[PDB]
Amino acid sequence: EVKLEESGGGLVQPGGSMKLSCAASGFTFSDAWMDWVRQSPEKGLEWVAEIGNKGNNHATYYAESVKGRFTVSRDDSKSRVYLQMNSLRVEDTGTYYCTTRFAYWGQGTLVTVSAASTKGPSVFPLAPSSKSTSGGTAALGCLVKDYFPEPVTVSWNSGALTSGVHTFPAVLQSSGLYSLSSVVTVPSSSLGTQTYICNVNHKPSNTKVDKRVEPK
Amino acid sequence: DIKMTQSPSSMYASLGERVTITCKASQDINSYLSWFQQKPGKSPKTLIYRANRLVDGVPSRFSGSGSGQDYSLTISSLEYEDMGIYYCLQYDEFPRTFGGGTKLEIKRTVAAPSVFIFPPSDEQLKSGTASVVCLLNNFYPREAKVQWKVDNALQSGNSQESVTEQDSKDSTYSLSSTLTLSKADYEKHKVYACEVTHQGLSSPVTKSFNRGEC
Ligand SMILES: CC(=O)N[C@@H]1[C@@H](O[C@@H]2O[C@H](CO)[C@H](O)[C@H](O[C@]3(C(=O)O)C[C@H](O)[C@@H](NC(C)=O)[C@H]([C@H](O)[C@H](O)CO)O3)[C@H]2O)[C@H](O[C@@H]2O[C@@H](C)[C@@H](O)[C@@H](O)[C@@H]2O)[C@@H](CO)O[C@H]1O
Numbered sequence: 001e002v003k004l005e006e007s008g009g010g011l012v013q014p015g016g017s018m019k020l021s022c023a024a025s026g027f028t029f030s031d032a033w034m035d036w037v038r039q040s041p042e043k044g045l046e047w048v049a050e051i052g053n054k055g056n057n058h059a060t061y062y063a064e065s066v067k068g069r070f071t072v073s074r075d076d077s078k079s080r081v082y083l084q085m086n087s088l089r090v091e092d093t094g095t096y097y098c099t100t101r102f103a104y105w106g107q108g109t110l111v112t113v114s115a116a117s118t119k120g121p122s123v124f125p126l127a128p129s130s131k132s133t134s135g136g137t138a139a140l141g142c143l144v145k146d147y148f149p150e151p152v153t154v155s156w157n158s159g160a161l162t163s164g165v166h167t168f169p170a171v172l173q174s175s176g177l178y179s180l181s182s183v184v185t186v187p188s189s190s191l192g193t194q195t196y197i198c199n200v201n202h203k204p205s206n207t208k209v210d211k212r213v214e215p216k
Numbered sequence: 217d218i219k220m221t222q223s224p225s226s227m228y229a230s231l232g233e234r235v236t237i238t239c240k241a242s243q244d245i246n247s248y249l250s251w252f253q254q255k256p257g258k259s260p261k262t263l264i265y266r267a268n269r270l271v272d273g274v275p276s277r278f279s280g281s282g283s284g285q286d287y288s289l290t291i292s293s294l295e296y297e298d299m300g301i302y303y304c305l306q307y308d309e310f311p312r313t314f315g316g317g318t319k320l321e322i323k324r325t326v327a328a329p330s331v332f333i334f335p336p337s338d339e340q341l342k343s344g345t346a347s348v349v350c351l352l353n354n355f356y357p358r359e360a361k362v363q364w365k366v367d368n369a370l371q372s373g374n375s376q377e378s379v380t381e382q383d384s385k386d387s388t389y390s391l392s393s394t395l396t397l398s399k400a401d402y403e404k405h406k407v408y409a410c411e412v413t414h415q416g417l418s419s420p421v422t423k424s425f426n427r428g429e430c
């Protein structure tokens with residue numbers, strides 16, 4: 001199948017530089033024209049740059065807002081497309097996607113342009129209540145607090161536990177740090193038998209935390 | 217720059233309903249128009265290109281029509297997995313330009329939230345800050361009032377809410393409300409309560425705890 005995977009996104013100060021990469025497989029790469037598209041809550045989807053195939057001799061095209069600061073290029077022998085970003089602005093912040101002929105998309109890589117500091121999260125248990133529930137279901141979770149930049153991922157019991165999990169969108173606190181919670185509904189009878197561990201990963205700070213969530 | 221205008225900005229539709237959304241360009245774009253669906257936290261997926269051509273693998277309930285400036289996407293019979301935000305794109309000229317998006321949410325029967333309250337952890341309290349969490353699980357519709365009372369004193373400006381988008385399996389929402397106090401403030405009050413008002417409840421539900429009590 002067609003596959004695209006972007007990389008290189010991270011935190012950079014305003015005025016800094018950052019290079020994104022997109023690894024492509026599952027199609028004749030040299031015949032495909034490629035685009036970078038970015039997304040932010042304030043601007044929605046925004047086209048960034050296009051690079052042609054050999055049909056138009058790898059010609060490039062740019063949005064006016066990035067012309068002269070961003071450069072798109074490609075390595076047909078490596079099946080890679082690149083986006084070099086210089087003189088970055090706060091408004092360049094967003095999720096950057098690589099796409100082939102606007103028909104298939106990568107997963108996206110997050111670019112954060114900010115003067116704020118990288119900070120790894122503290123992970124606190126949301127312990128299941130000791131008061132029983134009427135019908136035998138309890139809730140527990142983990143609070144992933146005070147981190148920057150996004151993103152954090154959360155799994156439960158190293159991925160075995162997916163049923164009943166809700167991981168909330170991060171909220172930006174007044175401090176400029178993100179916080180979120182991940183919760184799971186489980187049987188009240190199992191709280192003595194079953195171990196519950198939330199696996200938190202904050203790759204921007206190289207943080208991995210496994211927090212056990214116990215009653216009381 | 218070609219302006220792409222999508223309508224409606226957001227809508228609700230029922231399972232099995234026929235849904236049509238529109239995308240209008242500021243000039244003739246010669247059918248170089250694509251449609252995308254984006255689910256929460258995931259990348260867009262292309263549904264239709266050149267106005268009416270299905271991307272391979274896309275369900276047949278999706279179809280596109282139009283020419284010149286005005287285009288439409290139709291879902292013949294809405295499925296739960298069709299929830300999300302839909303975008304259009306013109307690629308007749310440079311710059312390529314996107315529409316502003318149409319949010320599509322699924323109607324369903326009212327579901328009252330299951331409410332849970334969590335005191336701050338002893339581990340967190342060492343830090344000097346206290347987070348109290350109120351959880352509303354699997355409810356519909358989205359509208360829900362969550363008020364914090366500390367020793368029966370209404371709180372304002374010290375809580376933050378997060379809401380999930382509709383769950384792909386049952387079309388419900390979940391919501392967390394987190395009350396943030398200093399540890400000193402937390403340890404000088406006793407009763408912590410979150411009051412939930414939701415149309416699936418006959419009357420407001422209150423979950424509360426007494427600081428320190430098991
Ligand atoms: C297939 C290919 O790469 N052909 C390029 C050609 O690019 C094509 O140009 C036409 C218009 O002439 C159109 O823009 C094609 O776009 C679409 C389409 O609407 O058909 C976009 C769709 O997302 C895509 N769908 C999928 C599933 O991939 C389809 C599909 O690839 C083709 O229809 C299959 O045949 O393509 C576009 O692909 C290219 O033309 C140049 O670049 C274009 C982007 C456009 O700016 C043209 O004005 C321009 O001349 C030429 C020259 O480089 O090279 C061919 O190989």
Ligand code: NA
Nearest residue numbers: 247265266269
């Ligand atoms: Na064609």
